[PDB]
Design an enzyme around this catalytic site. Sequence first.
Site, PDB file in Angstrom:
ATOM      1  N   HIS A   1     -80.512  10.847  29.152  1.00 38.54           N
ATOM      2  CA  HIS A   1     -81.434  10.447  28.095  1.00 38.54           C
ATOM      3  C   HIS A   1     -82.449   9.416  28.567  1.00 38.54           C
TER       4      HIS A   1
ATOM      5  N   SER B   1     -85.354  15.539  29.662  1.00 37.21           N
ATOM      6  CA  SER B   1     -84.981  16.844  30.185  1.00 37.21           C
ATOM      7  C   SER B   1     -86.118  17.455  31.004  1.00 37.21           C
TER       8      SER B   1
ATOM      9  N   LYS C   1     -82.446  26.962  17.335  1.00 36.57           N
ATOM     10  CA  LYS C   1     -82.338  27.715  18.580  1.00 36.57           C
ATOM     11  C   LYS C   1     -80.929  27.629  19.152  1.00 36.57           C
ATOM     12  N   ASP C   2     -80.341  26.430  19.154  1.00 39.11           N
ATOM     13  CA  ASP C   2     -78.972  26.289  19.636  1.00 39.11           C
ATOM     14  C   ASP C   2     -77.983  26.948  18.686  1.00 39.11           C
TER      15      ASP C   2
ATOM     16  N   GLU D   1     -56.971  33.016  39.304  1.00 36.03           N
ATOM     17  CA  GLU D   1     -57.746  33.547  38.195  1.00 36.03           C
ATOM     18  C   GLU D   1     -59.171  33.856  38.647  1.00 36.03           C
TER      19      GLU D   1
HETATM   20  C1  LIG Z   1     -79.827  21.192  24.008  1.00 29.63           C
HETATM   21  O1  LIG Z   1     -79.999  20.028  23.222  1.00 29.63           O
HETATM   22  C2  LIG Z   1     -78.798  19.313  23.014  1.00 29.63           C
HETATM   23  C3  LIG Z   1     -78.625  17.920  23.626  1.00 29.63           C
HETATM   24  O2  LIG Z   1     -79.669  17.351  24.387  1.00 29.63           O
HETATM   25  C4  LIG Z   1     -80.759  16.916  23.599  1.00 29.63           C
HETATM   26  C5  LIG Z   1     -77.323  17.140  23.411  1.00 29.63           C
HETATM   27  O3  LIG Z   1     -77.192  16.058  23.882  1.00 29.63           O
HETATM   28  C6  LIG Z   1     -76.199  17.753  22.570  1.00 29.63           C
HETATM   29  C7  LIG Z   1     -74.871  16.958  22.371  1.00 29.63           C
HETATM   30  C8  LIG Z   1     -73.869  17.492  23.440  1.00 29.63           C
HETATM   31  C9  LIG Z   1     -72.834  18.107  22.834  1.00 29.63           C
HETATM   32  C10 LIG Z   1     -71.715  18.615  21.878  1.00 29.63           C
HETATM   33  C11 LIG Z   1     -71.976  18.568  24.093  1.00 29.63           C
HETATM   34  C12 LIG Z   1     -70.580  17.803  24.262  1.00 29.63           C
HETATM   35  C13 LIG Z   1     -70.934  16.294  24.017  1.00 29.63           C
HETATM   36  C14 LIG Z   1     -70.622  15.241  23.211  1.00 29.63           C
HETATM   37  C15 LIG Z   1     -70.741  13.752  22.779  1.00 29.63           C
HETATM   38  C16 LIG Z   1     -69.288  15.278  22.299  1.00 29.63           C
HETATM   39  C17 LIG Z   1     -67.931  15.195  23.128  1.00 29.63           C
HETATM   40  C18 LIG Z   1     -66.709  15.855  22.378  1.00 29.63           C
HETATM   41  C19 LIG Z   1     -65.640  15.066  22.059  1.00 29.63           C
HETATM   42  C20 LIG Z   1     -64.695  13.824  21.945  1.00 29.63           C
HETATM   43  C21 LIG Z   1     -64.572  15.978  21.287  1.00 29.63           C
HETATM   44  C22 LIG Z   1     -64.694  15.844  19.696  1.00 29.63           C
HETATM   45  C23 LIG Z   1     -63.529  16.590  18.928  1.00 29.63           C
HETATM   46  C24 LIG Z   1     -62.828  17.752  18.858  1.00 29.63           C
HETATM   47  C25 LIG Z   1     -62.171  19.149  19.057  1.00 29.63           C
HETATM   48  C26 LIG Z   1     -61.811  17.473  17.660  1.00 29.63           C
HETATM   49  C27 LIG Z   1     -60.427  16.838  18.138  1.00 29.63           C
HETATM   50  C28 LIG Z   1     -60.113  15.545  17.297  1.00 29.63           C
HETATM   51  C29 LIG Z   1     -59.939  15.302  15.960  1.00 29.63           C
HETATM   52  C30 LIG Z   1     -59.785  14.516  14.629  1.00 29.63           C
HETATM   53  C31 LIG Z   1     -60.220  16.692  15.200  1.00 29.63           C
HETATM   54  C32 LIG Z   1     -59.416  17.127  13.899  1.00 29.63           C
HETATM   55  C33 LIG Z   1     -58.002  17.790  13.935  1.00 29.63           C
HETATM   56  C34 LIG Z   1     -57.530  17.850  12.679  1.00 29.63           C
HETATM   57  C35 LIG Z   1     -57.508  17.451  11.171  1.00 29.63           C
HETATM   58  C36 LIG Z   1     -56.061  18.470  12.558  1.00 29.63           C
HETATM   59  C37 LIG Z   1     -55.997  19.803  11.672  1.00 29.63           C
HETATM   60  C38 LIG Z   1     -54.769  19.537  10.743  1.00 29.63           C
HETATM   61  C39 LIG Z   1     -55.042  19.436   9.411  1.00 29.63           C
HETATM   62  C40 LIG Z   1     -55.183  19.474   7.855  1.00 29.63           C
HETATM   63  C41 LIG Z   1     -53.543  19.015   9.047  1.00 29.63           C
HETATM   64  C42 LIG Z   1     -53.518  17.490   9.484  1.00 29.63           C
HETATM   65  C43 LIG Z   1     -52.403  16.555   8.906  1.00 29.63           C
HETATM   66  C44 LIG Z   1     -52.351  15.269   9.320  1.00 29.63           C
HETATM   67  C45 LIG Z   1     -52.699  13.992  10.116  1.00 29.63           C
HETATM   68  C46 LIG Z   1     -51.118  14.673   8.453  1.00 29.63           C
HETATM   69  C47 LIG Z   1     -50.692  13.145   8.639  1.00 29.63           C
HETATM   70  C48 LIG Z   1     -49.468  12.720   7.755  1.00 29.63           C
HETATM   71  C49 LIG Z   1     -48.942  11.475   7.853  1.00 29.63           C
HETATM   72  C50 LIG Z   1     -48.723   9.980   8.209  1.00 29.63           C
HETATM   73  C51 LIG Z   1     -47.758  11.451   6.786  1.00 29.63           C
HETATM   74  C52 LIG Z   1     -48.064  10.458   5.581  1.00 29.63           C
HETATM   75  C53 LIG Z   1     -46.953  10.577   4.501  1.00 29.63           C
HETATM   76  C54 LIG Z   1     -46.949   9.735   3.447  1.00 29.63           C
HETATM   77  C55 LIG Z   1     -45.843   9.852   2.379  1.00 29.63           C
HETATM   78  C56 LIG Z   1     -48.028   8.642   3.306  1.00 29.63           C
HETATM   79  C57 LIG Z   1     -76.368  19.152  21.963  1.00 29.63           C
HETATM   80  C58 LIG Z   1     -75.234  19.781  21.129  1.00 29.63           C
HETATM   81  C59 LIG Z   1     -77.669  19.930  22.185  1.00 29.63           C
HETATM   82  O4  LIG Z   1     -77.805  21.012  21.710  1.00 29.63           O
HETATM   83  C1  HEM Z   2     -68.732  20.354  31.953  1.00 27.80           C
HETATM   84  C2  HEM Z   2     -69.320  19.976  30.816  1.00 27.80           C
HETATM   85  C3  HEM Z   2     -70.836  19.677  30.733  1.00 27.80           C
HETATM   86  C4  HEM Z   2     -71.489  19.435  29.596  1.00 27.80           C
HETATM   87  C5  HEM Z   2     -70.880  19.425  28.178  1.00 27.80           C
HETATM   88  C6  HEM Z   2     -72.879  19.195  29.909  1.00 27.80           C
HETATM   89  C7  HEM Z   2     -73.870  18.918  28.998  1.00 27.80           C
HETATM   90  C8  HEM Z   2     -75.217  18.886  29.269  1.00 27.80           C
HETATM   91  C9  HEM Z   2     -76.280  18.936  28.292  1.00 27.80           C
HETATM   92  C10 HEM Z   2     -76.086  19.044  26.765  1.00 27.80           C
HETATM   93  C11 HEM Z   2     -77.443  18.884  28.942  1.00 27.80           C
HETATM   94  C12 HEM Z   2     -78.848  18.904  28.301  1.00 27.80           C
HETATM   95  C13 HEM Z   2     -79.106  20.268  27.667  1.00 27.80           C
HETATM   96  C14 HEM Z   2     -79.039  21.348  28.716  1.00 27.80           C
HETATM   97  O1  HEM Z   2     -79.295  21.050  29.908  1.00 27.80           O
HETATM   98  O2  HEM Z   2     -78.742  22.513  28.357  1.00 27.80           O
HETATM   99  C15 HEM Z   2     -77.159  18.784  30.359  1.00 27.80           C
HETATM  100  C16 HEM Z   2     -78.087  18.707  31.372  1.00 27.80           C
HETATM  101  C17 HEM Z   2     -77.794  18.695  32.716  1.00 27.80           C
HETATM  102  N1  HEM Z   2     -76.570  18.984  33.283  1.00 27.80           N
HETATM  103 FE1  HEM Z   2     -74.794  19.095  32.280  1.00 27.80          FE
HETATM  104  N2  HEM Z   2     -73.030  19.294  31.277  1.00 27.80           N
HETATM  105  C18 HEM Z   2     -71.795  19.590  31.822  1.00 27.80           C
HETATM  106  C19 HEM Z   2     -71.547  19.764  33.165  1.00 27.80           C
HETATM  107  C20 HEM Z   2     -72.485  19.705  34.171  1.00 27.80           C
HETATM  108  C21 HEM Z   2     -72.255  20.060  35.552  1.00 27.80           C
HETATM  109  C22 HEM Z   2     -70.918  20.573  36.127  1.00 27.80           C
HETATM  110  C23 HEM Z   2     -73.386  19.875  36.232  1.00 27.80           C
HETATM  111  C24 HEM Z   2     -73.537  20.141  37.749  1.00 27.80           C
HETATM  112  C25 HEM Z   2     -74.716  20.047  38.368  1.00 27.80           C
HETATM  113  C26 HEM Z   2     -74.389  19.384  35.301  1.00 27.80           C
HETATM  114  C27 HEM Z   2     -75.698  19.056  35.581  1.00 27.80           C
HETATM  115  C28 HEM Z   2     -76.695  18.857  34.652  1.00 27.80           C
HETATM  116  C29 HEM Z   2     -78.059  18.469  34.940  1.00 27.80           C
HETATM  117  C30 HEM Z   2     -78.628  18.222  36.353  1.00 27.80           C
HETATM  118  C31 HEM Z   2     -78.719  18.379  33.782  1.00 27.80           C
HETATM  119  C32 HEM Z   2     -80.201  17.992  33.585  1.00 27.80           C
HETATM  120  C33 HEM Z   2     -80.955  19.166  32.970  1.00 27.80           C
HETATM  121  C34 HEM Z   2     -82.431  18.876  32.969  1.00 27.80           C
HETATM  122  O3  HEM Z   2     -82.826  17.772  33.420  1.00 27.80           O
HETATM  123  O4  HEM Z   2     -83.215  19.748  32.520  1.00 27.80           O
HETATM  124  N3  HEM Z   2     -73.798  19.295  34.054  1.00 27.80           N
HETATM  125  N4  HEM Z   2     -75.788  18.794  30.521  1.00 27.80           N
END
Ligand SMILES: COC1=C(OC)C(=O)C(C/C=C(\C)CC/C=C(/C)CC/C=C(\C)CC/C=C(\C)CC/C=C(/C)CC/C=C(\C)CC/C=C(/C)CC/C=C(\C)CC/C=C(\C)CCC=C(C)C)=C(C)C1=O
Ligand code: HEM
Lengths: 164, 45, 62, 81, 241, 54, 379, 379
Positions: free
Chosen positions: H201, H205, H227-228, H271
């Site tokens: 960031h 990009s 688009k995404d 795999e």
């Molecule tokens: C192209 O442009 C773009 C960009 O560039 C401009 C970007 O940058 C991005 C952004 C990049 C992306 C997404 C890519 C990945 C990047 C990220 C920051 C995010 C990273 C991801 C994570 C940490 C993972 C997030 C989470 C996931 C899978 C969820 C896991 C965790 C959880 C909470 C989830 C929920 C699970 C649930 C609820 C369980 C399901 C069960 C439910 C009902 C039953 C549950 C029951 C309970 C707890 C019961 C408890 C009971 C108790 C205590 C009992 C109590 C009793 C009483 C009496 C009080 C995008 C999309 C983009 O497009």
């Molecule tokens: C494994 C999980 C990964 C996630 C979730 C992730 C996520 C992202 C996202 C969201 C972007 C911007 C949007 C896009 O490029 O489509 C990006 C850009 C980029 N990613 Fe990843 N990435 C991952 C792994 C990797 C890996 C393995 C590489 C190895 C080279 C990599 C290299 C890059 C680079 C160089 C950019 C810059 C793109 C640009 O400048 O145009 N990333 N990544």
Amino acid sequence: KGFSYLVTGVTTVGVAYAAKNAVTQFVSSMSASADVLALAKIEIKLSDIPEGKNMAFKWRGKPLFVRHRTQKEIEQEAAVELSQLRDPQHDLDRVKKPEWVILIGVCTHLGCVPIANAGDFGGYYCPCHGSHYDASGRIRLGPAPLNLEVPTYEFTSDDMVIVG
Amino acid sequence: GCVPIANAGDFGGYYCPCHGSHYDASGRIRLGPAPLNLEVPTYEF
Amino acid sequence: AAATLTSKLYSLLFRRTSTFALTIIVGVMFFERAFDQGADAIYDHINEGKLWKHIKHKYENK
Amino acid sequence: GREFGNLTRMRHVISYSLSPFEQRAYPHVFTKGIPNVLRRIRESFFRVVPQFVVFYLIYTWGTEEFERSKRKNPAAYENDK
Amino acid sequence: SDLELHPPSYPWSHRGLLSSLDHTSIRRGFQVYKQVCASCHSMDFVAYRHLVGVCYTEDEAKELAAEVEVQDGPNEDGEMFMRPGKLFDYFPKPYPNSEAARAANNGALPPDLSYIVRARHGGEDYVFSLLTGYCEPPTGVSLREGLYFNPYFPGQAIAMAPPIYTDVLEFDDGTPATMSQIAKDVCTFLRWASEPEHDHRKRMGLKMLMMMALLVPLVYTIKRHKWSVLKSRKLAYRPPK
Amino acid sequence: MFMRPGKLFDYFPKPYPNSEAARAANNGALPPDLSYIVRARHGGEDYVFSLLTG
Amino acid sequence: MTPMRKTNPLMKLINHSFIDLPTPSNISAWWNFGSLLGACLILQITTGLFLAMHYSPDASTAFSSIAHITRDVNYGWIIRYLHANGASMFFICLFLHIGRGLYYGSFLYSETWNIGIILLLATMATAFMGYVLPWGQMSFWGATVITNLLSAIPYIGTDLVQWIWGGYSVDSPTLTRFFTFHFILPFIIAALATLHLLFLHETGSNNPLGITSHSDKITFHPYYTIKDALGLLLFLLSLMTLTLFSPDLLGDPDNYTLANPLNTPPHIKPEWYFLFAYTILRSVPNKLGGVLALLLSILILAMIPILHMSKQQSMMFRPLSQSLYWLLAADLLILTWIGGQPVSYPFTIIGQVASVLYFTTILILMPTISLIENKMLKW
Amino acid sequence: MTPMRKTNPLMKLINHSFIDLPTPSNISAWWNFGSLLGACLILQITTGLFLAMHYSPDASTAFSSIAHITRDVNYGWIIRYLHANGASMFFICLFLHIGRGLYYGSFLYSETWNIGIILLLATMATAFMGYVLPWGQMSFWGATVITNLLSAIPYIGTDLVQWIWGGYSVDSPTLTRFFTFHFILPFIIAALATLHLLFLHETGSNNPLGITSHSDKITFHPYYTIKDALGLLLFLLSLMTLTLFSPDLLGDPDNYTLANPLNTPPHIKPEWYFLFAYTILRSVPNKLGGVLALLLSILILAMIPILHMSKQQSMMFRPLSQSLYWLLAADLLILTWIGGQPVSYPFTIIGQVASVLYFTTILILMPTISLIENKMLKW
Ligand SMILES: COC1=C(OC)C(=O)C(C/C=C(\C)CC/C=C(/C)CC/C=C(\C)CC/C=C(\C)CC/C=C(/C)CC/C=C(\C)CC/C=C(/C)CC/C=C(\C)CC/C=C(\C)CCC=C(C)C)=C(C)C1=O
Ligand code: HEM
Ligand SMILES: COC1=C(OC)C(=O)C(C/C=C(/C)CC/C=C(\C)CC/C=C(\C)CC/C=C(\C)CC/C=C(/C)CC/C=C(\C)CC/C=C(\C)CC/C=C(/C)CC/C=C(\C)CCC=C(C)C)=C(C)C1=O
Ligand SMILES: COC1=C(OC)C(=O)C(C/C=C(\C)CC/C=C(/C)CC/C=C(\C)CC/C=C(\C)CC/C=C(\C)CC/C=C(\C)CC/C=C(\C)CC/C=C(\C)CC/C=C(\C)CCC=C(C)C)=C(C)C1=O
Ligand code: HEC
Ligand code: HEM
Ligand code: HEM
Ligand code: HEM
Ligand code: FES
Ligand code: FES
């Protein structure tokens, strides 16, 4: 200045000491439980096995063969060629005592159990395909890339053999 | 948790060999140190 | 009139941080052995006869 | 407002300090330290202590009454005869 | 019924903060267990090992294990057989299943002794008082024919018959056999069986104490050293007049 | 341990108690469990059909 | 030529939060528990991760698995005890972390205060599902009682209980899901903790006096690092002393006996940190009344900021409020003690009096005395 | 009153990261695989989480629990296949993610490119340990071979292989230990994925042309969210087709048989996503040399930015570099195909030739052709 830095220097020593100890605990927990060691390497075996007889044992879940063999059977081993193997190995380089042979009890072809005191060489016989082996078990008829496994064993007393 | 005896009890109900505690057929507290009556989820026959 | 022990310890060792680290780790090496042995001896002296290593004598080597 | 450069606007203040290596780490810890701690304890003794004393009294009586209840009743056996 | 009689605190050799367990007591305690206890009580989480470094030597443990007989895996092209037993087999259980045990003990189930000390309040203190104090019921109480009075049992009625009296066994050490003596040894052995890290735990505690004694004053000194500049700071206010 | 007449929740009876008895009665060969044989062998049921017919 | 910790993005965050964070200079030890909480979390996580490598989350082998850890796994006993004892330390610091805010008026930071309430509930859930994992008598029956407490819902009731149980009772399926939930929640608490610190930095920390500290702010790296490094040493000293000298003091026996669905121990008291709420439940005969009480309890913390009426943050300058505070603390001690005692006449009445006193003090007495103090100061 | 999304702390990050960060207008569909990867990561967690509610990590009950999930548990079969097939889709997106960078020159963003390499290595670890959980015939032997290949380490290998095993073989302790690592590792990957975005960031990009696009930036939300979203719909289409029609095409049968320690299957293979590496190690005659080759390879990805010597970022205007790039892609396809075939004279020589061709292409051919292309344009 020297006094103050001394305090700091001594303090780090204490922090270092505990640090090492703590890590060695957590790492050691992953090494092996006591039961694993108890069940493994515990393969003391008597030398009373007659000549040619093959008393079956167990070792790491693998059946294990320990055979005393007569002199003429060792002569039959000489008949078989150690240069006719995919992985040649000289006879005495395999067995520390030619009259003693310790080997695994599973064939490498399909996991079948060879029959002791059988086969055209007088060694092992696999009924699954009639495969023949010698007292040393040299791979002769089978896909096995190399010879039958030579398990690690060590003679400590004349009557016992450690295998672990 | 001692199993009541079949066709037992001083009142035609149940008899507990563990302490001699007697229970009626309905399991009501009649004799014995048992704090509450015998716990059956549903009185469905 | 002799230069104080701490002053000598400072100029030769503490002045340079790399030597300061070197002396620390060597001290750890030495103090670990000393501290461990001393503590173990104290613990054994508190419980003579109870610990089995002091009992081996009554039955050993058949 | 979140950087040391600009937090408040002060004026006409002076401060004096000495290096850590030019002063003792435990100065007057025998003649001036202990009395200050005693001042601290005394100044807040009656504001806290007495309430927790009531808790202790409630705790002791309770236990006493609980055990007193399990004692057998001589008035439930005098007439039982 | 009535509030259970609390056992008294006995002077065990390991009550001290830094004391250990007399390992000769454990040896004799196990000797008691081998026949008097194992009739119906069981130790599910103990093996013939765990004793090599505690009481018995390697060879003596192996010889002792040979005296038992376990059942082994299915013979190839065969069925189950009986194996002598090695230093990885847990102690023999007395009955195949809980229900069989109940049948042979008037419906009572003898609990496993592996964690009995940590399971009951009072620990070994409770067990010692329990093993002794098998008196007759006071005037005004009756008991089932297969139960025995014991004031320390929470119900005062227990199906355990008095298990230990004098001259039941004969220690090889030559120590005279006395109900109190046997109870002391077995209680020590049980305390071990529920806590074999006792000695090691306390040794680490000793080292921790000395290390803290050295460290805490040192770290406080460093804190005071760094903070001195603030604690001695003096301020003044000099407006334009 | 007594023997029940059998209920719905019961699974299909085991021909043999242990693999050793199975092989002993099958001249050393161990007949595999069929619960996943189709998705285990290559060729699917095509392999099985041709295997039985040939 | 300029410092490299003011250019790299990953170092900008560390510089803001840790090194060049402006912090009041007069903050006392009460402000240390915050750090300790995170430290304890970091400990628990690692300790638990190592226990997971040898634990079998099944109703027929979980108890045996623990027995194997403490007798065969190298230094398994210490790891298990550190985890168990470290949980109690967590709550102790957590209760003292909440008390400071109540006393010094830190609740005025709405955002941060609300995030904390969520963190508390998340940690409470984590500890409850962890305590059922060992599968001891107390574990099995404690879950049963607490889980049957949802039957008080008017029309759904049983459905939730059977849904959570994965069956008609508590058995292996319940154990497995609890194991997974136990594993995951702590990592969710870490994310919540970052949000907690996030909203905090916008305003800064509150000094004990309650007056603006902008004239006496100092950096955090040289002073509070060592001050918070001394607190952590004391925290470890207490934890190691508990583990190495009294491994089973804050626990309870009957967790070393296999769980029996048929037999039930008499007292069946829950864990010490879940005792004050337990007494509040038993004080009200109705089930619906009790559950509402439990919830209304935690809710009070959210309402406390609204109940504030004094024109000052800290109670340091308001002695009457101080006396009420300490009486409230003593009431909580009584609630805990009662929770540990059997159901009987004196305990039951005392518990009811403690419960009503608890609520009345917070909801009635505190605002009234605050106004009174405003009157004697001619505000 | 100004919008709240520019004042609330939590909303500032969301606004910066998603709603309003400038983006090039011309980025093609290749720039859509990054968002999908995270989505897949999210999908892989939830599904696996539910599977964890029923799986038992033991040498004996692991296979049984999988069968129980597939048949008795409600909708267990679909969850398992989504998890299994989502893994393959994750790697397909991952390779396309890497490929885009190599073609369009995104590697110039060193900080972002290096973090990516770590994410790839972590991903592979998660996938490898997950494949052991089913505890089938292929899982047992796959782990055995890929672990015994550390005995070649000069002097510590043998010591560091038994330590990983927790014993002198591969048994239940390995299974439980891998289970914990499988659970934890993906969450670390999620945290690292936030460092990837963070370092990205601060620069912005890239675009296909390779020229800076400050003149024609666009707000991310309306245009690229839809688009995404379209890309996500297509990704779901592919995943559901794989699971709902032919779930097992991409898997390898014989994994549906109980693991037999004393039975080596005739043809052990990793795999599909790992095959390319397998052939690179199976070819080198020396055992240690094969490990050095599998490692030196993966790391040439870290060396790509150094070997770059062209005066243009994007290979769009470099027709000769395009031919080499497709040739290298074909080489990877050959390596994949050889990985799945038995050892024999024709495959071995083909694999050897492919390995040397793979390396020499990256090292010598690409820099030399870039220099010639520079000479042609008269820079
Ligand atoms: C192209 O442009 C773009 C960009 O560039 C401009 C970007 O940058 C991005 C952004 C990049 C992306 C997404 C890519 C990945 C990047 C990220 C920051 C995010 C990273 C991801 C994570 C940490 C993972 C997030 C989470 C996931 C899978 C969820 C896991 C965790 C959880 C909470 C989830 C929920 C699970 C649930 C609820 C369980 C399901 C069960 C439910 C009902 C039953 C549950 C029951 C309970 C707890 C019961 C408890 C009971 C108790 C205590 C009992 C109590 C009793 C009483 C009496 C009080 C995008 C999309 C983009 O497009
Ligand atoms: C494994 C999980 C990964 C996630 C979730 C992730 C996520 C992202 C996202 C969201 C972007 C911007 C949007 C896009 O490029 O489509 C990006 C850009 C980029 N990613 Fe990843 N990435 C991952 C792994 C990797 C890996 C393995 C590489 C190895 C080279 C990599 C290299 C890059 C680079 C160089 C950019 C810059 C793109 C640009 O400048 O145009 N990333 N990544
Ligand atoms: C055919 O059988 C086979 C397979 O099939 C079956 C396979 O699958 C595989 C593949 C192997 C698979 C599983 C096993 C391999 C596992 C591993 C190598 C890894 C071991 C580890 C794991 C479980 C643990 C993973 C570690 C984790 C989470 C720790 C990281 C944690 C963090 C937060 C990350 C933090 C990092 C931070 C702060 C650093 C910040 C900065 C950076 C990236 C910046 C880069 C910095 C630099 C110096 C680099 C820049 C360099 C520059 C200019 C110089 C250029 C460089 C050059 C080199 C030229 C094999 C081998 C195989 O045989
Ligand atoms: C009072 O003022 C203050 C403030 O306010 C003014 C503040 O704000 C702050 C702000 C800071 C805080 C409170 C600090 C805490 C803040 C937080 C949010 C809390 C956050 C806590 C956390 C993230 C938790 C941290 C710990 C975590 C997750 C656990 C860490 C450990 C691990 C994952 C495990 C690491 C490894 C371990 C034990 C080693 C054992 C394992 C192995 C070697 C691995 C074995 C092998 C494998 C996986 C195999 C891999 C390879 C394989 C299969 C094959 C390879 C190839 C082959 C060929 C074989 C402070 C301090 C303060 O004071
Ligand atoms: C040899 C010394 C010995 C010790 C030590 C021992 N046992 Fe027991 N034990 C039982 C039975 C049955 C119970 C359950 C109720 C009872 O005590 O009658 C029990 C209970 C116990 C209890 C306490 C039960 C509880 O719930 O608190 C302890 C402790 C104990 N046994 C240990 C059968 C036996 C038998 C079989 C004749 C023998 C021998 C025996 N017990 C001898 C011993
Ligand atoms: C459960 C895990 C928790 C963690 C890891 C945590 C972390 C922290 C930390 C490190 C601080 C800084 C300490 C300071 O500067 O004084 C802090 C402050 C604070 N915490 Fe928490 N906390 C937790 C729970 C709670 C709870 C349950 C509450 C309930 C209200 C809460 C409310 C607060 C408040 C109000 C502050 C600001 C104090 C001030 O500004 O003086 N926290 N937290
Ligand atoms: C704030 C975070 C946590 C708290 C408060 C907590 C609390 C607890 C408690 C109180 C117990 C029962 C202790 C006992 O019965 O003696 C327990 C058990 C357990 N916890 Fe957690 N825990 C936390 C985090 C974790 C994590 C991150 C893991 C990851 C694996 C974990 C794994 C376990 C395991 C395996 C057990 C079984 C204990 C045993 O077998 O004896 N815990 N936890
Ligand atoms: C990027 C993240 C993940 C990847 C790439 C991944 C990959 C895999 C793969 C390839 C398998 C083999 C399944 C099979 O062959 O049938 C597997 C199994 C499994 N994984 Fe995941 N996984 C991920 C995340 C998770 C998470 C977060 C959990 C739990 C919280 C989990 C739990 C499981 C379970 C229980 C299995 C056993 C399923 C079976 O045996 O079929 N996984 N994983
Ligand atoms: S079983 Fe040995 S060659 Fe067929
Ligand atoms: S067993 Fe029922 S009254 Fe005692």
